[PDB]
Copies of this chain bind each other. A is one copy, B any other.
Amino acid sequence: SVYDAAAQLTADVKKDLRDSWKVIGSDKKGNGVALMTTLFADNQETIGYFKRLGDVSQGMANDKLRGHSIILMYALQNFIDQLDNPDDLVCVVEKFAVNHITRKISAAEFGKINGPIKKVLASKNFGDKYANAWAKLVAVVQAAL
């Protein structure tokens, strides 16, 4: 359930999430496009879903992909800001879950973002500790799918 998943975000997890978000959230365009191109390069089978964004190999030059990527980083901004209150974190998680359920994205396929996040964190010198904290936040969205 989303409520049990949300209960796993302990004080330490929340701390690691905010501390890493301080660094990767400072460049939403850059790290957002980085997240997306790493997803597509590492998991080429997901590109079919992003048919509306056109030629994703163009990266930053693709205006629809740049728009999409910035907006995705504000969804993560939103989750970080709701960590104090689990009732609000769950209702924004469930709204974004609906946007993925209508695109037929399963929990397993949503989980493919963990690889990209681990990599962008590692290029900013945030290791496995931080990648695991973010995997727990992704798990809250997965519970809603």
Which A residues contact B (CB, under 8 angstroms)?
28-29, 52, 63-64, 66-68, 70-71, 74-75, 77-78, 81-82, 87-88, 90-92, 94-96, 98
Which of chain B's residues have a CB closer than 8 A to the CB of A78?
A: 70-71, 74
Which of chain B's residues have a CB closer than 8 A to the CB of A77?
A: 74, 77
Looking at the assembled complex, report how far the CB atom of A66 sits from the nearest CB atom of chain B, in whole angstroms.
Answer: 5
Contact among B29, B75, B81, B94 with A88 in the assembled complex (CB-CB below 8 Å): B29
**Residue with the highest number of chain B CB atoms closer than 10 Å, among A29, A74, A90, A95:** A95
Do residues B71 and A95 form an inter-chain contact, with CB atoms below 8 A?
A: yes
Chain A contact residues, majority secondary structure? helix
Looking at the assembled complex, report how far the CB atom of A59 sits from the nearest CB atom of chain B, in whole angstroms.
Answer: 13
A88 to B98: give the CA distance in the assembly, Å.
26
13 extra A-B contacts, CB within 8 A, seeds A67-B92, A71-B92: A52-B98, A63-B87, A63-B90, A64-B91, A64-B94, A66-B91, A67-B88, A67-B91, A70-B88, A71-B95, A74-B75, A74-B77, A74-B78
